[PDB]
Symmetry: D3
């Protein structure tokens, strides 16, 4: 690997991936004896223990191309189970800020990265691992956290204008919008990794936040070590 | 409707859909007082009771265009919950004939029917209802039936040649191939219906037996539909 | 064959295909000594004689994927000449219910089945056999039937909405809409089969009907056996 | 019109179009009292009489974009019936040099010009006028000419390489390759013009020629004026 | 070649290409001892000298398919440097009729000719040779001619309707529209030829005069080609 | 802006953008009185003076989606001139490590981000600003640095396999491969910003490095303030 410079044995098989390096550092506090194993290119990676298991928390930056690079290199270092923990904008009225969304699939526009990996324009089912996702639901339910289960649209252009945005994507079965779930799910299916995702609603297109991010992180870490 | 000619209220809200009219007839014997509510164009639809609950068993033919028409017309007659029960060809070697596959998503080639409904070529997530699919897993487990959970490729050309077929679709996360799950899942997401699918493995690309497998799984699906 | 379980020798080289099993059974009364050679999966197939030749009438269901399977299996049993006889909705105001349309070509949205068979998105000319089609015109003339010759749009989504449907397809040279001739024509040109199509107008998007179907069926049978 | 500077009244309703200015000049000798009504940009157009009717012979250059412009301008001047007469390379072994191909449809790769005119990638049936085409068959028969009826592939890249060229297009129902009938047919169906095409085989990818061109030209003129 | 029927060595390595045969003839009078090296199919090609250097002026007709054939055949006859000199319609209001546009790149709709040459739908950068384009800017500046530098949209359908034409292409970084730059640039990149383009503005979508503009710019192009 | 939290007046009109936060910090040393104006999400942005002008050095992360976000927000804060300074893998034999490439255009696979911004699949010319790029050449020439001018392929999948990679892209006129030039150029053309790019060759697919990066940075800063 040329972006994540951690040595083999420094990355755990179980990894919690976040887009914001700042969140990676903040969540490392939930691990026992956390150690920084990479800082190159801003991709902070911490490794420690939790619930009798070794786990790593890694930064993936923003966008499909960026997360694909991080997942590929972490895998080269031993990782094989990834749970995405990010933020999202809800596309439906009833979901409130600070609540969570457990992702069941990802809609996306074809092209670029997908074409290079799949070699044609087939719409391959972009879904998380069945069992891992159910473990997430169980964990969030045990911690009495309010969540919704559903598909999300993985956008590549956060600023491209679309006057029909909310109605378009929500009418297509998506309850939220984010940017890297489709890449995570599809690449994992091709590579044989087990992946899932949970998002914190930080906006609704249709301190309390710190509490939300922290609460959800504990639930994800429980899932990763169960 | 112009294809399904059922009379007012003859169709249940929950429907078990199959591609073979012969299977619809056969499975209708699992229902209490089954009645033939439609026979037009060969699309046999029966309605009766299972565990005290009213349900229908409907024929959808072969292919996306056919199942789309049947789902649209059943919905106009009052249906809003659909569980497809079909046959499939496995794409991986560890799955045996007669076992079952509970579908979690569907891969497909874009264009045609999807372009007309979606209005562009976006790859909209073609997935079943989460809750309903989990209920199916529970039902099959309770009846000690051997199943696998995974995605399938919904093909439009049964006889089209592809020398790299198995490796291509299996390397893409699909464990089996059939022809209408992608249409079922996507149209349901768009129209607001709750759908799911269970398939009986009849071939592995990697009669008494088949009928027994079909009958055993049908009970598990019906349990789910009336739960 | 997996869906049509007729024994080889029971399917004629000349086949009249219809989408409705009910029409197959009704039209079988026009043959001499008809025998049901298949009913599996609802695909009724009858074989008998008409003006000195053996002919089969087969059901193809609805949609490209369905007719493709039926055609491939009938061919594996010995069929090589197909004439589709179905229903259609006119796209132009001057065509009346009960009249006929002899098809000269089919417009279609590419993808799916065409991509699997052609291996790319080329717009292969989807046309019927020239000779067979002219014989159809001659047969319908001889019987004094009212027909029109033109292209049709083979739709894959009967219920999908399009606010400009009639204007769009009629301005693209199509005079009616149906669902399987694009598949019939293209697959035939690829496999080397001789095919054609006649449609009965049952709607105009822009007793008598029973007689319309029967009258045109006789014209089609004369052609198949000419 | 911007490219064809003929004055209105100088272009006939019936037009024989050829790609080579030189063939336009040569074939003008078959008309009575021919007059050059345009030479701008090399697009020679001649107008005269033949068996009681006024007819024009026009040059269309090479390629879809070129013929599209010429057709649009000839139409703005009063033309509404077009018959292309060009050269082609056979894709099947039994067709010999000097023989003719009466075109029934055109296969093409979508995009560019078709996207600009149709507004999306729909595979609109690219076929000639049914009546006009049958009249061509009759005319060529009467003159005892050797012809074949079939589809052709309208290529946009004469020199692009394709190791499977002949096998691919011949297996797709095409018996010859040319460059502008897909444009001719589709644009005609959209604009409401009546069009057809006959080609002289000058190569087989799978004195005498001068006479072949002249013989078929007479057949085409009889059709245009029938 | 089967379209350009020139005899051995009658075509120069450097060629000024134009779409109008009439312009080729007219500009040939700027050359020392001009000779007509081809007239087949109307594609007039002349060869002569300019500033002691041998050069050719060739006709390419209209559209990508036509210019591709002509460029391929000229290259088979020894040409490897091409500068297109055509006419264009401006897409922005500040450019006046008779002024010039030195092209830096070409926008285009995919498919057809590009698919056959590139073998897929990748958007390969359709740009001219950097060095040659800079030489054109210098040449035009030396002759005090009014020019603008920018990208153009290479259209395949002159008469196809588009109610949002000007705003669409101008908002996409294009300052003018014509029909064969995309083909010229892309084919040249693939075949190893050095190409560039200069256009005379004959219309703004936002005879004596035109001929003068055409003549003045032709000298600047010829200076560049023989530099 | 929600990713780059710098206040208006804290970002200069002229910006040098790099993918690696580490390079942003290292190059800030070349500015007079540099100040850190943003660190949120790891997107380090420094602002200072150079050659009598105010300039900013900003981090854009990896990939089209990531750089699009950074450019959009910097623009919202006043930036309008951007020069990309990154690393690349050469696709041609003759270019050596440590040397530079001044980009004249970017090839790319359509889809995702481009579709969302352009609203269809047109291949819009992805080129840098003419004048700015020439200023770069002048600046690199004045500092006696070895550079090559040419197009690059902007890949979205750094790890997707392609056995024909080098020959494919180099035969298409690209001399190097990177990941965000196409997004930079195209978005700038749409938004009206002036952009350019120079890359340091760090690999050839067909301390000394520190020196190369530093030398090139001075040349880019000269260009930005000229």
């Amino acid at each position: 690997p040329v972006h994540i410079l951690a040595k083999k044995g420094e990355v755990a098989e179980r990894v919690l991936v976040v887009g914001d390096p700042g969140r990676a550092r903040l969540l490392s506090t939930l691990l026992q004896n956390p150690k920084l194993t990479n800082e190159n290119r801003g991709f902070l990676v911490y490794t420690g223990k939790y619930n009798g298991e070794t786990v790593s928390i890694a930064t993936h930056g923003i966008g499909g191309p960026s997360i694909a690079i991080v997942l590929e290199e972490l895998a080269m270092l031993g990782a094989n189970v990834f749970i995405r923990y990010g933020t999202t904008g809800a596309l439906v009225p009833y979901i409130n800020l600070g609540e969570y969304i457990i992702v069941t699939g990802a809609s996306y526009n074809q092209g670029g990265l997908f074409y290079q990996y799949l070699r044609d324009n087939a719409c391959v089912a972009s879904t998380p691992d069945f069992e891992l996702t159910n473990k997430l639901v169980t964990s969030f339910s045990k911690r009495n956290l309010k969540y919704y289960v559903g598909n999300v649209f993985s956008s590549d252009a956060f600023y491209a204008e679309d006057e029909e945005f909310v109605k378009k994507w929500s009418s297509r079965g998506n309850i939220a919008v984010e940017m890297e779930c489709a890449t995570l799910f599809t690449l994992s299916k091709v590579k044989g990794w087990k992946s899932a995702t949970v998002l914190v609603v930080s906006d609704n297109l249709a301190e309390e936040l710190e509490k939300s991010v922290m609460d959800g992180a504990k639930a994800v870490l429980d899932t990763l070590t169960s």
